[PDB]
């Protein structure tokens, strides 16, 4: 389907994702905890009944009609976690996730309100701008010809060096600013 | 409201859920107890463990991240990364 | 940006189709332009006409609200398939079955309101009786004229 | 002290929320029984709805013909 | 047994129900790995500029510029007048003009004919 | 300065709005038009002293 | 700072409807592994929750008591 | 007005019966009560409709405030399938939610009795579209259904929310 | 009017003799003094216009247009001094001289008592506007856009020249004050049909009419910010001013000649508004919104009722202020991201909150929120077109949905959502920019307190 | 104040307060508190300002336009006389507009003041309103945005020809 | 209504699994009305806002 | 509500149509039936400013009730007896309306029996 590092979904990954989606939609159907716990064991038994199927065409067919079973028996409003996509609190705080570079745009009279914070920020900025050329020359000496096959990034293969393309993963805003 | 999570607290809660799971004995269990290689758990059991983590901490782990959590320490570290603990 | 990275005319020769597919950063096997009926598309790819809500919401997107990467060819109606707008995501009930259920429910309710308007309910009473010639002066009737006498009797 | 959060068990309760909740529940039932005791016709009916068949034809003016 | 899901325009077929998802062939792995390679090259070219400390501004996307140039400037140079474009440009261009012309002309002829006969109640109508 | 809210947000606005209504609004015609008061049998008019006569005696029902 | 979690061994499913679930799963040859995780919802201070008619009649006792008090007060007050 | 209000108060109260987001249930509740207001305008009772506005304001604002107390106490949880056991843990919210539901359904001599019941007493005893009357009464039963749905899945039973209370 | 013509001309030695650091501040100061003096035009009477001389007069139609014209020059100087900061000094003075010359043509366009002097100033307004677009526009297409702006106007207006000289020969005069009293009824004929077309099509191009509007989303897009402000705020209103002067001479033939054009506007304001739902270029979205709003002024002039003329002049003044503010807001983003694509820079309320408040107020006045004079003009045109035909409310009301829908989508795309990650040059709002927004919006909201000065000759 | 005959008001008849209950109404307490805390200081400030007005009293006037010859006795295309006739007609048009405004104010004040029996008790105001709107509609409706004294004279002549033909064909 | 929904509430504690009907999916998906009308009526506008009117 | 079934599911010519009834003269069956007497003067319920639905044959109890309700402010529970008098006289008026409906029902049954006796005879 669509994955950052994998080019596809294995049969094992499809079975596990169907199993989790079936349990979540079943818990949406079966609100009470003992009753869901009973039917979740029954559904686990249904998944365990065809676990030892070495015939891959038979297993892919069983996966296909199990997906049909799921698409028939899904809840119309399944439960979604609040910060999960489709949830009631999903991407709520994105208006509070001001990026860090805006701190470069502050007036000095409001940068002087936090002297320790910006004095501690300038060494992060210095660390990033010395790490940058080392991680660029690390990326170009490790990426194959034709470009990178996957979106997987390498770690720092030396000591003292930072991982390549690290700044916006580390300096991302908090979930609750 | 909303008490902060610590790595000690997240570790205690993850191991507390795994101790309430009948396919794991509580004395063999540690934070490095690999589910398939040490505890001998099924991949279906790993999916149920990650779903118990979701029902415990109240957020959804995506499946592309769920299928790589194969020890309790990686689960604790993922919850650390997605809740931004030890500020 | 330069001219041979901008959209151009409709590709006919296969090297022109491959150069277009290289320009829009997609495979030649996946590059399909809009069919040259003269509607003004040129070499622009006919992306499969799905909404942006249908994308993987957990993927590390370059544009998270758009669910859209950098350099990926945008859909012709990308401003239409934003998540503020038209969603083509699959529904649990079929589309035709939804339309039949909604149409039948609304048509049945309007039919039965017409039925109840034809056959209304009421109470087993006479008309409400008002004094002073059915209140002739109170309803704005002019006093220089004289109405007919409306007479009510005891029962 | 404010309420400490608990884990997998019933939380700490203030006495004040308990007595306020019980007081307003008792106030609701007091008011319902009081107004049902004093009005008693907004629910059951105010005036007796007569049977029109029991009316004689002479008071309705029906000559038997 | 089970009703087959019928995909529509505004409700597509799910990924879980599509048969071409379950192709285990070699050429689909070729196409998916090549799409992964193109997408990874685009991702790398993006975030080598996105994470750059020296860059301060807008990472120009040729896809976005190309999209706006297709939506605005490439429309007329790739227009060809033919049967379909003439019928659609005369159907959606002057069709509503004819329609609203006859509707508003009919309404105003009816209204003027009522007014000059003394039929339309224009009693307290002194604002116009 | 303990009830300064009742002075700055209430009492000075009541002063201003009563000055505006008394010497600039009611000095102009039909700006404040009040419904005339509901008159009952047995009332006494303050301006005149005219007693409204009572109703007819009732054909008592209960 | 530190929050103390209780003993995990106290959440036994005996006395809960998880026990009835394990009975019906053993009646056809299954076993429930996540019962002790679900055990805290059915035990402790959350045990013995009221019915709906018991939820409606919250405060009916003291309310009816004060009602009888007020009816006696107004019956003695008019004489 | 009578037909449109009866259609609205039927349809929204019917949609309220199977929802799980609590704010959606209370929103279909208040749109059903607005449909009932449009009904009692349509039977030429505008002052009973305005009395039902002034009546409905108190308990429906209170029902949203009690639901928001539950939502904030459960860490922004709005789905009723992650609730339960809140009769004793949230006693004041439970008390006021039950009082709000009884005022909504028309418990005698609470505030929702003093307009809505009279509305029915004028909806029956008038020269009325009879299908509008029957759908208004079906909606009146549906109000009690979604009110005890709120009380059942939120306050009654055993918990379904997560473990850090 | 010579007390306004001579200070506008003295702005030329004021801008050519100033010191190099002083040529913006002096012109801004003295143009604000001229705009302060512009309120002496408000000596308007219930019966007579304010008739200065044989050449110049001003009624209550031209007076708000003159105050808006003399007010727009300081705002254009504020808007256009940032992106011309790196400019050569003599070219900077030539730019300011083109704006001064355009204002000088406009103030005696609106006060021309005689209609061929109106035509000469009305077509003299091409040359500074054409030079500004084709010289200080940013992109390549400004040359083509200048050609379209030139040759729609002249192709519409050179028949108007022949028509005005024909009225000059027939009536003996083109004094508007004489032609108020010597106007003859224009009977039904083919001669009078093409007479009506020659009188009206130049102003139909200037409004623009739908179908003739193709010059506008090029000329208002390929221009610098001062050019877009003067085009959408004043130069679209020359058409409405000219129609309100020229439909005096075109009766009773207008009462059936207007029927196609009314359709072209009543359907046109449905189409162009709908076009604003699917525009990627923000400046083009404001341009098609300008076409949509001016379609109502075309309908209100062509139905020629008093409520329609009052609503049309109110809507022209209100749209001038609103559309000028919207172009200035689009420039405030374009000076930061260097692209007019609306989907590029999103979530800007997270970064520019006060500027997002200015976007909010401009979009609320765009969607005709009461009691703004936007809504006053909108509502009065709706009243008069309801009296024209009771069905038109549909085409009005559907427009009043879509006018809301693009006004907030523009607010949602630019200001709301998650911000674009790769854009990091979003500076805080300069004091000049917020000053420009407030000098657009605060007059527009103060005019709600006293709207009778922008309601025209028949209040 | 204003002129009580062009804006007429009927005599106010308020009832004497005849309290039957034993509880005090808060309205009399609030009326006394409003008289003390609000009405007396506002009265003192207004008397101060009015003394300051009386220290220097000067007058403004209602402008009187004498009547000039109207559009009928002006020659055709004679701008010096028909200009004066047009200014006379425009002033009369604005004044007739405000006469209609006066009668609308009378009707709305009558409706609010009479309250519930407004349909019976405001028949004279409704009749005066119907007459003045019929007069204004015969006089100025449908002239257009380019109205003039010539347009109004042409409308009047068409109306008089219609009335003359309707009179003559009924005899 | 209270009694029938008490029956509805007590049938949720039962250890039976039911498939959703068409009445249930009709009520749960908002009478199908925000699903159809918020996909259809934007579509026939916005294509018409671009393909017909704009392009 | 059985009369709805007797007019719709049954035969409609024998049930009185509430839009246009009485269809019979008010003296048909009545030797010297007396009129309904209005107690409140038209000027009195004009000065009481009653709603035009409230100016029926029992408005005098409503005038007394509103005079009580004004004269007993703020005690808003001290006029229950006047309210009960007004509600009972409205009840008597509703009973009289029911009597008119029943008189029209029995007269249409009388006309049915009259035409059936005629058709059986001739
Ligand atoms: C003759 C003398 C007259 C004196 C009185 C003045 C009359 C009105 C003039 C204009 C008033 C508004 C000006 C401020 C808005 C613009 C700047 C801004 O956003 O500042 C935020 C800022 C406070 O926010 P912040 O936290 O600091 O930062 C902003 C945030 O980042 C982000 O900001 P935010 O989003 O959180 O906050 C923005 C918020 C956003 O809220 C909205 O957008 C909602 C508004 C619409 C709905 C509500 C209003 C609906 C209409 C009803 C009201 C009018 C009629 C009421 C009467 C009864 C009914 C008829 O808007 C407001 O808070 C403003 C409230 C008033 C809005 C007016 C309506 C605008 C809507 C569009 C037009 C509609 C018709 C307008 C009719 C005007 C009639 C006068 O305010 C200021 O700093 C104020 C600066 C000084 C303002 C001076 C105003 C007068 C200037 C005239 C000078 C010359 C004459 C001399 C008089 C001087 C008087 C002092
Ligand atoms: C925006 C682009 C399009 C612009 C359209 C402009 C208006 C469309 C019609 C214009 C017609 C030409 C001007 C008419 C002037 C009328 C003055 C007058 O005295 O009329 C009465 C006179 C009548 O003659 P007369 O008045 O001398 O006669 C004495 C009076 N009677 C009739 C009683 C004997 O009309 C004419 O003489 C001819 C009028 C029509 C002329 C047709 C030729 C021009 C062809 C069309 C050109 C269209 C625009 C070209 C540009 C297009 C884009 C590049
Ligand atoms: C008494 C009489 C009673 C009569 C009652 C019925 C009258 C009206 C009939 C139906 C018309 C209105 C309903 C149809 C349009 C609804 C549009 C809408 O609200 O779209 C919402 C949609 C997003 O909705 P959703 O998917 O739920 O969002 C959550 C997750 N994204 O948002 C989007 O997709 C964004 C869309 C933006 C562009 C809008 C394009 C459509 C514009 C439609 C204009 C309709 C004009 C009607 C004029 C009527 C005149 C009488
Ligand atoms: C008619 C017809 O078939 O026109 C097609 C013709 C081109 O011929 P083709 O179809 O290519 O062979 O195309 C032509 O002849 C050119 C277009 C014909 C005229 C179209 C008129 C209306 C266009 C829209 C106007 C909107 C205002
Ligand atoms: C394209 C871009 C978007 C649009 C921009 C504007 C362009 C169009 C501008 C002009 C519009 C057309 C002319 C104005 C229409 C006026 C009404 C009319 O002509 O009706 C049709 C006419 C009806 O007959 P009638 O009007 O009585 O003619 C006798 C006159 N004494 O019918 C007839 O007489 C028959 C037809 C006669 C031929 C007329 C040709 C000249 C007019 C069109 C040029
Ligand atoms: C005949 O039945 C006259 C009454 C009005 C019409 C029928 C109304 C039926 C619904 C109301 C009563 C419901 C009792 C459960």
CSV table of N, CA, C and O in Angstrom, one decimal, chain J residues 3 11 17 21 27-28 49 55 61-62 65 85 88 92 97 106 109 118 121 132-133 137 140 145 150 155-156 159 169:
chain,number,residue,atom,x,y,z
J,3,UNK,N,-43.7,69.8,19.1
J,3,UNK,CA,-45.1,70.3,18.9
J,3,UNK,C,-46.0,69.1,19.1
J,3,UNK,O,-46.0,68.1,18.4
J,11,UNK,N,-54.3,61.3,26.3
J,11,UNK,CA,-54.0,61.5,27.8
J,11,UNK,C,-53.6,60.2,28.4
J,11,UNK,O,-54.3,59.2,28.3
J,17,UNK,N,-51.9,52.9,42.4
J,17,UNK,CA,-51.5,51.6,42.9
J,17,UNK,C,-52.4,51.2,44.1
J,17,UNK,O,-52.4,51.9,45.1
J,21,UNK,N,-51.6,42.7,48.4
J,21,UNK,CA,-50.7,41.8,49.2
J,21,UNK,C,-50.2,42.6,50.4
J,21,UNK,O,-50.4,43.8,50.5
J,27,UNK,N,-40.1,47.5,43.5
J,27,UNK,CA,-40.1,48.5,42.5
J,27,UNK,C,-40.2,49.9,43.1
J,27,UNK,O,-39.6,50.8,42.6
J,28,UNK,N,-40.9,50.0,44.2
J,28,UNK,CA,-41.0,51.3,44.9
J,28,UNK,C,-39.7,51.7,45.5
J,28,UNK,O,-39.2,52.9,45.5
J,49,UNK,N,-25.5,72.9,33.6
J,49,UNK,CA,-25.2,73.1,32.1
J,49,UNK,C,-26.2,74.1,31.6
J,49,UNK,O,-25.9,74.9,30.7
J,55,UNK,N,-26.3,81.7,30.3
J,55,UNK,CA,-25.3,82.8,30.4
J,55,UNK,C,-25.0,83.4,29.0
J,55,UNK,O,-24.5,84.6,29.0
J,61,UNK,N,-32.2,79.6,12.9
J,61,UNK,CA,-33.4,79.9,12.2
J,61,UNK,C,-33.8,78.7,11.3
J,61,UNK,O,-32.9,78.0,10.8
J,62,UNK,N,-35.1,78.6,11.1
J,62,UNK,CA,-35.6,77.7,10.0
J,62,UNK,C,-35.5,78.5,8.7
J,62,UNK,O,-36.1,79.6,8.6
J,65,UNK,N,-37.8,79.2,2.2
J,65,UNK,CA,-37.7,79.3,0.7
J,65,UNK,C,-39.0,79.9,0.2
J,65,UNK,O,-40.0,79.2,0.4
J,85,UNK,N,-37.4,76.0,-10.9
J,85,UNK,CA,-38.6,75.2,-10.7
J,85,UNK,C,-38.1,73.8,-10.3
J,85,UNK,O,-38.8,73.1,-9.4
J,88,UNK,N,-37.1,73.9,-6.6
J,88,UNK,CA,-38.4,74.0,-5.8
J,88,UNK,C,-39.0,72.6,-5.7
J,88,UNK,O,-39.4,72.2,-4.6
J,92,UNK,N,-39.6,70.2,-2.4
J,92,UNK,CA,-40.9,69.7,-2.1
J,92,UNK,C,-40.9,68.2,-2.0
J,92,UNK,O,-41.6,67.6,-1.2
J,97,UNK,N,-41.4,63.5,1.4
J,97,UNK,CA,-40.7,62.3,2.0
J,97,UNK,C,-40.8,62.4,3.6
J,97,UNK,O,-41.1,61.4,4.2
J,106,UNK,N,-46.2,58.3,13.5
J,106,UNK,CA,-47.5,58.3,14.2
J,106,UNK,C,-48.1,56.9,14.3
J,106,UNK,O,-48.6,56.5,15.3
J,109,UNK,N,-46.1,54.6,16.7
J,109,UNK,CA,-46.3,55.0,18.1
J,109,UNK,C,-47.7,54.6,18.6
J,109,UNK,O,-47.9,54.2,19.7
J,118,UNK,N,-54.6,47.3,19.3
J,118,UNK,CA,-54.1,48.3,18.3
J,118,UNK,C,-54.9,48.3,17.0
J,118,UNK,O,-54.9,49.3,16.3
J,121,UNK,N,-58.0,50.4,17.9
J,121,UNK,CA,-57.8,51.8,18.4
J,121,UNK,C,-56.9,52.7,17.5
J,121,UNK,O,-56.7,53.8,17.9
J,132,UNK,N,-52.0,59.3,2.9
J,132,UNK,CA,-50.7,59.9,2.6
J,132,UNK,C,-49.8,59.0,1.7
J,132,UNK,O,-49.1,59.5,0.8
J,133,UNK,N,-49.9,57.7,1.8
J,133,UNK,CA,-49.2,56.8,1.0
J,133,UNK,C,-49.8,56.8,-0.4
J,133,UNK,O,-49.0,56.7,-1.4
J,137,UNK,N,-47.7,58.0,-3.6
J,137,UNK,CA,-47.5,57.0,-4.7
J,137,UNK,C,-48.0,57.6,-6.0
J,137,UNK,O,-47.4,57.4,-7.1
J,140,UNK,N,-45.1,60.5,-6.8
J,140,UNK,CA,-43.7,60.3,-7.0
J,140,UNK,C,-43.3,58.8,-7.3
J,140,UNK,O,-42.1,58.6,-7.5
J,145,UNK,N,-34.5,56.8,-11.0
J,145,UNK,CA,-33.4,57.4,-10.3
J,145,UNK,C,-33.0,58.7,-11.0
J,145,UNK,O,-32.3,59.5,-10.3
J,150,UNK,N,-40.0,67.4,-14.7
J,150,UNK,CA,-40.6,67.1,-16.0
J,150,UNK,C,-41.2,65.7,-15.9
J,150,UNK,O,-42.2,65.4,-16.5
J,155,UNK,N,-45.9,62.2,-15.6
J,155,UNK,CA,-46.7,61.2,-14.8
J,155,UNK,C,-48.1,61.8,-14.4
J,155,UNK,O,-49.1,61.1,-14.5
J,156,UNK,N,-48.1,63.0,-14.0
J,156,UNK,CA,-49.3,63.7,-13.6
J,156,UNK,C,-50.3,63.9,-14.8
J,156,UNK,O,-51.5,63.6,-14.7
J,159,UNK,N,-51.7,60.5,-15.7
J,159,UNK,CA,-52.8,60.1,-14.7
J,159,UNK,C,-54.0,61.0,-14.9
J,159,UNK,O,-55.1,60.4,-14.8
J,169,UNK,N,-65.8,58.2,-20.4
J,169,UNK,CA,-66.5,57.0,-20.9
J,169,UNK,C,-67.5,56.4,-19.9
J,169,UNK,O,-68.2,55.5,-20.2
